[PDB]
Design a protein around this ligand. Structure first.
Ligand code: MG
Ligand code: MG
Ligand code: MG
Ligand code: MG
Ligand code: MG
Ligand code: MG
Ligand code: MG
Ligand code: MG
Ligand code: MG
Ligand code: MG
Ligand code: MG
Ligand code: MG
Ligand code: MG
Ligand code: MG
Ligand code: MG
Ligand code: MG
Ligand code: MG
Ligand code: MG
Ligand code: MG
Ligand code: MG
Ligand code: MG
Lengths: 206, 262, 153
RNA sequence: CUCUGGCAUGUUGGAACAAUGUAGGUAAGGGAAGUCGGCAAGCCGGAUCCGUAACUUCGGGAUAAGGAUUGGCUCUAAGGGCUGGGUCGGUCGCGGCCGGCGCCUAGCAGCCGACUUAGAACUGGUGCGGAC
RNA sequence: UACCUGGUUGAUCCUGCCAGUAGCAUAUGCUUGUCUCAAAGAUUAAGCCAUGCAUGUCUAAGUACGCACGGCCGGUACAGUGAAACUGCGAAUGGCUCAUUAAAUCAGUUAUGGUUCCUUUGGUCGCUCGCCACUUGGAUAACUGUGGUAAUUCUAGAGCUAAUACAUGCCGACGGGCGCUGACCCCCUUCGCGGGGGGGAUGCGUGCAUUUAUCAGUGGUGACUCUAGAUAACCUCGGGCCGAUCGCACGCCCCCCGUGGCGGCGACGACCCAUUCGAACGUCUGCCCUAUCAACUUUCGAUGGUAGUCGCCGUGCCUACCAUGGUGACCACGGGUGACGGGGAAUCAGGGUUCGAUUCCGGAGAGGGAGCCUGAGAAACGGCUACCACAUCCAAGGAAGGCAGCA
RNA sequence: UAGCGUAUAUUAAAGUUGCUGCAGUUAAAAAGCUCGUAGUUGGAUCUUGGGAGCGGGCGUCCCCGCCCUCUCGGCGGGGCCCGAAGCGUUUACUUUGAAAAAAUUAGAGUGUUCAAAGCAGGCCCGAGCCGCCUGGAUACCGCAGCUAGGAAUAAUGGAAUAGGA
RNA sequence: CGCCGGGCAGCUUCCGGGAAACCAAAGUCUUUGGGUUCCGGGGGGAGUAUGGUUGCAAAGCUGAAACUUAAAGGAAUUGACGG
RNA sequence: CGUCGCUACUACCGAUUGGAUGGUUUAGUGAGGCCCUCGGAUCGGCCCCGCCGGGGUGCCCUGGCGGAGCGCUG
């Protein structure tokens, strides 16, 4: 099949190398996983040594990490917006190791409300009446209020992050290897990395 | 090849096995075990070519199936079990135990040991680390691993493992002034006191060691096996006390023994 | 110019760029920590890699490569490639029949990190073996020695 | 093919749609077996990217030979021209005279305008130099 | 044993080759009484093969309701030996040959902190709080019975029957603890406030392994982005582990009692770690003849960079975008080889010159290519699939091939 | 001499391929001449001389000791002591050590009945010997790589507009 | 009339060499190594065939093989012969 | 010594778009395998839900016959 060998290549001098044996199994190559965005389908492939590799053919949920907040939640993938390797993979909507994507901010805002007790992603309020009043007030005692106001002074979110929170979609970078681990784990873009990537999307379109 | 080799040619066999070319094409390919096949001694050649208890491969298998040999206190039914270095081969039917120690000429010897001295074994720690739950682990040259070692033991040190318990009785640190035995290379089977250890970063260290006769010889660090404290060994020694004699003196030693016997 | 001249983003994977910079810490572009490691073997990490801003995953000091194996030496021949140079090693091969030597040379491709900024053609370079960085590169520059230079008129 | 301008089909019309002609096409399978002779017809053909032999008077041969591509639609990239770059009432002809009063100098800011080339995605019953 | 001798001339000194001389290594001729070893279809044809064999295997310890025998000792699950068959393991070693192969293989050296590893050995396996458990489900074998085909180790329909096969799934340890969330309450500096601390009702994860992100710095290297901790989570329905397994003797507790709970020796089986056997790709140096091969590689990766894909992993291994690089008279590239490489063999002053198909190590191949299934390990050929070349039987509808294994 | 002849490949002979070690006026042969990059090869010169008992005998023979620095000396304050760090170049060279499979080669032992071989084997038994003593060495293994000594020969450097110690 | 150095040479010599003719180089060579180029390997075929390259051509440079042969040659010696 | 004349042998040139055998390749067709996306010839489970038996007391324990949901599903 596909070959991972080195002896099919021209040598350093540019000369042509004559192979001394036929294709061996251990230097094989398998077709690209080509992960998509959709309902979870995973194919198990038996690999060298009798172990298993997971082909993430189609993925919908992904375990991402805020990083600066130590908040890691299982969100859903909206759609890939960029890929530094090849722009064709973006419009084909293919998930690879280092493609940046848009993810839902619903679990991230939920942790923000239940921990910091400050509004995030809210425009005017009075829109989640069965719960949001309870989580903002909580009628808690003096010690609990004095615990929440300790973290309120440093519960500050950079402008780029909160703006995407109002958008409902956060720019994240994948870190796992779909087709190898069968997952689409990653982290959330922020800081100079987010500012640089944002200029990349702006130059690409708009 | 397409897979692992399970045959061993007679000439390709290790030299210290003392196998001869004429008896057979093959050799007792040692099974996988605690010791490398290049440095082991399979049990078949122990009971046939050394102790003369059995004549061929079938007879030596008969004792194993009668369950009389207890390598390290455990019954081994493998005809080609790799014994290795400093292992108590105990046959309690004859009440005779052997410690498999190299002799002067770098070959495994028939070193009879007393039953009380046969209840323990020295081992060289090959690496130490910490596993799950912060539990320290230690492995030996005999491939046996123990949990909860004494923190004072570092790598390339010696421990006194106890049979039937698998615990530590005592340990010997590796430093200058300790009695060791070379377990590989040209000086294999020699005993001396550590004099110096030259550290070469990125490469193998070299240890200079001086025997009781004053002859000083070097070797690699991995070939160093400390077997005592100061000058007193912790185990019984084979005949010759681990000295090396140049060809001049064992010649006249043989002549003197022939003269005395004649 | 800067260190961002690619479609990806250059950063050191160990170093976390974002440290939750809030009012308690003056947000005046605080210096991000720089990951560096001593490599052993008596080689000193240069101040260029200590106080630099470049990103190079193949750097012996500020990258994910471990120097192990043979330490060789050579003379710089070509510097016309990105972050790699070609060195020439000259030796004598002995011909037993004639009891005489012959000059033979080998061109070796090594990876030159930008921490060695003032390398020039003809200078001595000591290199260290590592994992295969590219098709023909298996060595990293570890030290640079000038050849009767340091002065230019 | 059309506009301005011109014309009434070239010294007759009508009805039919036989043979034989004259002019023009198509033809299964074969492929010059036809014939003095490939006569006649047919094949090829534009442009882009490759690739081109013998021989040679070294200029040529040469569009040698041979091969791939070509539509529509949606974009992307490159290829230019114009002006303006001031640190300030220290004053008065919200603007004009000199100057203590300044560092674009890796060049920007705005406006304007041709065709041409290259790359990519999508797309059609594989059709695209669609006729000429 | 560091050796010469005849031949050009009428004769002589030379140059110079021819011839002689000795060894070994193939053939061949003549001859051959004994005895000990001992090569042996390599050379041309890695050409073609009839036939026969060369890989199968069970202990007390996975599954016996074959009468195919048999103790029955006779009122009982199975005495025992056990053919057949399922399951497991092996069949990837060996053996043969030297066609291919010229920095390729291979030899020494070194690295894998860049990987996988059946099995052996040693760790680990109540660490996890979560009306079958005194044992759960549906089949398939062999077996009886209907046959079809000219034929093959071809086999269908029908009916049972098993498991360490194939699945499911508890109890138990298990009392709780930890870290979050904290209903509230209490001791409080007490005062008209804060308060310095406790217990905690209610919900959330608790272990190992995997995939990310973050914090600090128990052990170890020469050097970790090492190991080990800490937090937030994920944990893939062709989906990880947390024993629904089998023999050997049989003994202990009897208060609750009198029918249950305990127990030793193993054997098999396991996610993970280490060890062993290794394997794979790398580092440095090293190869015959040829210039009537001087410039090659780069459109189809050539040389590097960035980011990915795949792989067991490191790398243009492949892809996208970039830079124009890389190797050569210190012989690149190309061609030839009647080249497998080496350990070695012959000749023997010294130096060298030839030979190494051949029993040891490494490599490659199984008529030529190619692609795969299973398995830890194969691009396997005494495994499969397709084409090419030969070639077997046919009732012409089909089927079956691989002796460079021993004869 | 139970072996000998022949053919052919190869080795010595062949100092007739010549590095050791050949030739080039006339035998075969130095380019018609010069320049010239690769290649090869390159003048002299930098520590010598003097010392202390051990000493090839101050026994004026000379084993020969030769009459680098700084850090805890691991036997925050003992002289009874000797380890952590670098070389006041880089190499080549030479010596030592480590690691270098076996077989084969040389070579130790061994009456195989001698030998080629092989790795065995020898001693007593008065018969209870209700078994003792051994061997299965060693050398060599190029070149490349590793380690520690020496610094003669050879190459390469330092301070010259002083951006010198 | 001398001396020095660089030249073209000459005479002589048992320096030494060489097969000798002869050579102060053709010496310092089995007592064999100052540095470094080119180049020969019995005689013919043959400086031919073929390939490449140069040239307007004539030709130049590079350059084999099959086959054939026991000598071909060098220097000296004696004789014989000479228009 | 050379031409010419005769006989053998060995290479060379040579029309023949000479022929044959290997090797590497541009272009075109292309078996088979592998992967991916569909595909669903069939084989089962639940929903049973037409009946009857019913049971702690038509409020069924369910043991069966059996329409079948003509759905959810492997
Ligand atoms: Mg008309
Ligand atoms: Mg008209
Ligand atoms: Mg037609
Ligand atoms: Mg037609
Ligand atoms: Mg005709
Ligand atoms: Mg006709
Ligand atoms: Mg015509
Ligand atoms: Mg033409
Ligand atoms: Mg198009
Ligand atoms: Mg061959
Ligand atoms: Mg061989
Ligand atoms: Mg094979
Ligand atoms: Mg298996
Ligand atoms: Mg095959
Ligand atoms: Mg010879
Ligand atoms: Mg000669
Ligand atoms: Mg001449
Ligand atoms: Mg020159
Ligand atoms: Mg000199
Ligand atoms: Mg010279
Ligand atoms: Mg000649």
């Amino acid at each position: 099949g596909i070959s991972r060998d080195n002896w099919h290549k021209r040598r350093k001098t540019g000369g042509k190398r004559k192979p001394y044996h036929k294709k061996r199994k251990y230097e094989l190559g398998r077709p690209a996983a080509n992960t998509k965005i959709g309902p979870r389908r995973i194919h198990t492939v038996r690999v060298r040594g009798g172990n298993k590799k997971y082909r993430a053919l189609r993925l919908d949920v992904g375990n991402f990490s805020w990083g600066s907040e130590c908040c890691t939640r299982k969100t859903r993938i909206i759609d890939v917006v960029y890929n530094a390797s090849n722009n064709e993979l973006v419009r084909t909507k293919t998930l690879v190791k280092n493609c940046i994507v848009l993810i839902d901010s619903t679990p991230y805002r939920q942790w923000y409300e239940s921990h910091y007790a400050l509004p995030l992603g809210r425009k005017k309020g009075a829109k989640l009446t069965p719960e949001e009043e309870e989580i903002l007030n909580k009628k808690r005692s003096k010690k609990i209020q004095k615990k929440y106001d300790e973290r309120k002074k440093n519960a500050k979110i950079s402008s780029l992050l909160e703006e995407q929170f109002q958008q409902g979609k956060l720019l994240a970078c994948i870190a796992s290897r779909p087709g190898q681990c069968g997952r689409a784990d990653g982290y959330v873009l922020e800081g100079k990395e987010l500012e640089f990537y944002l200029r990349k999307i702006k130059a690409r379109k708009g | 090849a397409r897979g692992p080799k399970k045959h061993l040619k007679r000439v390709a066999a290790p030299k210290h096995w003392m196998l001869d070319k004429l008896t057979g094409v093959f050799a007792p390919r040692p099974s996988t075990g605690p010791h490398k096949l290049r440095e082991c001694l399979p049990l078949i050649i122990f009971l046939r070519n050394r102790l003369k208890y059995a004549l061929t491969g079938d007879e030596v298998k008969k004792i194993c199936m009668q369950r009389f040999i207890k390598i390290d206190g455990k019954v081994r039914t493998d005809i080609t079990y790799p014994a290795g270095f400093m292992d108590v081969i105990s046959i309690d039917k004859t009440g005779e135990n052997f410690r498999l120690i190299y002799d002067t000429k770098g070959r495994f010897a028939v070193h009879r040991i007393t039953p009380e001295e046969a209840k323990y074994k020295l081992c060289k720690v090959r690496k130490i680390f910490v596993g799950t739950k912060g539990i320290p682990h230690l492995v030996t040259h005999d491939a046996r691993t123990i949990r909860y070692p004494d923190p004072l033991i570092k790598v390339n040190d010696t421990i006194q493992i106890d049979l039937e318990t698998g615990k530590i009785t005592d340990f010997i640190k590796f430093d200058t002034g300790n009695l060791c035995m070379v377990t590989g290379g040209a000086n294999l089977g020699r005993i001396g006191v550590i004099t110096n250890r030259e550290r070469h970063p990125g490469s193998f260290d070299v240890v200079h060691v001086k025997d009781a006769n004053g002859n000083s010889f070097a070797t690699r660090l991995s070939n160093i096996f400390v077997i005592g404290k100061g000058n007193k060994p912790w185990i019984s020694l084979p005949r010759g006390k681990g000295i090396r004699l140049t060809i001049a003196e064992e010649r006249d030693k043989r002549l003197a023994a022939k003269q005395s016997s004649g | 110019a800067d260190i961002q001249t690619e479609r990806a983003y250059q950063k050191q994977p160990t170093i976390f760029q974002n440290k939750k910079r809030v009012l308690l810490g003056e947000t005046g572009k605080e210096k991000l920590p720089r990951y560096y490691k001593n490599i052993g073997l008596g080689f000193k990490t240069p101040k260029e890699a200590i106080e630099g801003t470049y990103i190079d995953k193949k750097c012996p000091f500020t990258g994910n490569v471990s120097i192990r194996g043979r330490i060789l030496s050579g003379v710089v021949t070509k510097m016309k490639m990105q972050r790699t140079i070609v060195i020439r090693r000259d030796y004598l091969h002995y011909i037993r029949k004639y009891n005489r030597f012959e000059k033979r040379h080998k061109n070796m491709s090594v990876h030159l990190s930008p921490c060695f900024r003032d390398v020039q053609i003809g200078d001595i370079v000591t290199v260290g073996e590592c994992r295969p960085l590219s098709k023909t590169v298996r060595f990293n520059v570890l030290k640079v020695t000038k050849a009767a230079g340091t002065k230019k008129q």
